[PDB]
């Protein structure tokens, strides 16, 4: 069958049934997303640059932009190369039970195959020029307009870091999550646009059981 | 049948012996680990002890360990969650490594709350002064009924430094979602206590090798146990 976000046979409460591959979606004790609500206050380097997408496409219910392996985040002496950035409407992670209309995930992998994913919400407000090459380029196959990855995130960020899982099947654990507290802005026309291309259909996995995930809250400079 | 020797049933093959033991290989948050990257933090009063001297319901050898079980009269309260102490058992050598450094012995204080959530407390021993606290266990195991009270309210240090993370049981079925608190400060043990303890664990190492670490989030803090 084909996993989706509907309230029926293939929906999130039933991903585990569709494939044995997806069983950890139910049996796992560190599944994402969660409500980030209880945490501790208290080594992250960015190597992003304007990058022309390898491809920009709609896949498995998300708007996805893939990249050549030229961008990295270095964490605790290991490089995690950015594979792709994709979008969720609404945001999957809740910070103290507050949702944003959109979020973006920056998905990275190190040499051992370990995953590090960075999440950040969007706020309804002013236009965000960075969204445009992705929105302009679903429409193309070839020389894509560069995504300003080095301008995308806040210069100064406050983040929550915890151990979790992929928020979509096969829901693999061992994902190093960094969730940024600061919203980016997106216009009313851009959001409606982005939400419409993901078929006016919510692609937000519900909050999963939280087994007292150890979450630290900190801050860093992205540039 | 699972064991710690280098043949069919050893640590490398636990996932193969039973399908319940599959998370022993497939898990992304398996224990023990080398504790070497961690975050320093506040003393948020998260961890409060309600311990008292307790006579073991039993002291016995099971699954390569020497175990003392207790009545549900002892607690750990964490972040507004109460965990009742189930048992104390031993590992030789110590399973969690602190900054890649060895210990000859460790103790795990295994707790379970009403929902079945697991919290385990670990502390190492070093060769030195004799430890009187171990003696009712060494003395109580060649006996079967009346066990001497274990001074649970005295076993741990009054002031502790610990590392807290979520991990797994270090023995099959390697269940994850285990709340680990590893106390950095060691307790003491004599050469005779260490040797007999090992003989009561049949002079056979019951130490799980270190498993892969997927960027485990560890906070380092401190508390007063009494
Ligand atoms: C190739 C790839 O990135 N696959 C992903 N599956 N789930 C993800 S999520 N919502 O946890 O970021 S990413
Ligand atoms: C009943 C019981 O306590 N079972 C345990 N299995 N593994 C444990 S450990 N070494 O992670 O503390 S405890
Ligand atoms: Cl998110
Ligand atoms: Cl230990
Ligand atoms: Zn995502
Ligand atoms: Zn143990």
Residue numbers in the entry:
A (entry chain B): 21 to 62, 67 to 247
B (entry chain A): 22 to 247
Paste lines from the article.
Bacterial carbonic anhydrases (CAs, EC 4.2.1.1), metalloenzymes that catalyse the hydration of carbon dioxide to bicarbonate and hydrogen ions, are emerging as new potential drug candidates due to their role in the survival, invasion and pathogenicity of bacteria. H. pylori has two different CAs, α-class and β-class (HpαCA and HpβCA). Here, we report structural analyses correlated with inhibition data, on complexes of HpαCA with AAZ and MZA. The structure reveals a fold characteristic of other αCAs of the known structure which contains a central 10-stranded, twisted β-sheet flanked by helices α1 and α2 on one side and α3–α5 on the other.
In both structures, the N atom of the sulfonamide moiety of the inhibitor acts as the fourth ligand in the tetrahedral coordination sphere for the zinc ion. The O1 atom of the sulfonamide group forms a hydrogen bond with the main-chain amide of Thr191. The sulfonamide group of AAZ is further stabilised by van der Waals contacts with the side chains of Val141 and Trp201. The thiadiazole moiety of AAZ stacks against the hydrophobic side of the cone-shaped surface leading into the active site and makes van der Waals contacts with Val131, Leu190 and Ala192. The AAZ molecule is further stabilised through a hydrogen bond between the O3 atom of its acetamido group and the Nδ atom of Asn108 (3.1 Å) and van der Vaals contact with the side chain of Lys88. Structural superimpositions showed that the positions of the AAZ molecule and the zinc ion are very similar in all eight subunits in the asymmetric unit. Superposition of the structures of the HpαCA/AAZ, SspCA/AAZ, TaCA/AAZ and HCAII/AAZ complexes shows a very good overlap of the zinc-coordinating sulfonamide moieties and only subtle differences in the orientation of the AAZ molecule, consistent with the absolute conservation of the protein residues that are important for AAZ recognition. In addition, examination of the superposition of the HpαCA/AAZ complex with the structures of free and substrate (CO2)-bound HCAII reveals that two sulfonamide oxygen atoms of AAZ are positioned close to the putative location of the oxygens of the CO2 substrate in the Michaelis complex (0.8 Å and 0.4 Å). Furthermore, in this superimposition the zinc-coordinating sulfonamide nitrogen occupies the position of the catalytic water/hydroxide ion Wat263. Thus, our analysis suggests that AAZ acts as a site-directed inhibitor by mimicking the catalytic transition state of the CO2 hydration reaction, which is in agreement with the tight binding reported for this inhibitor (Ki = 21 nM).
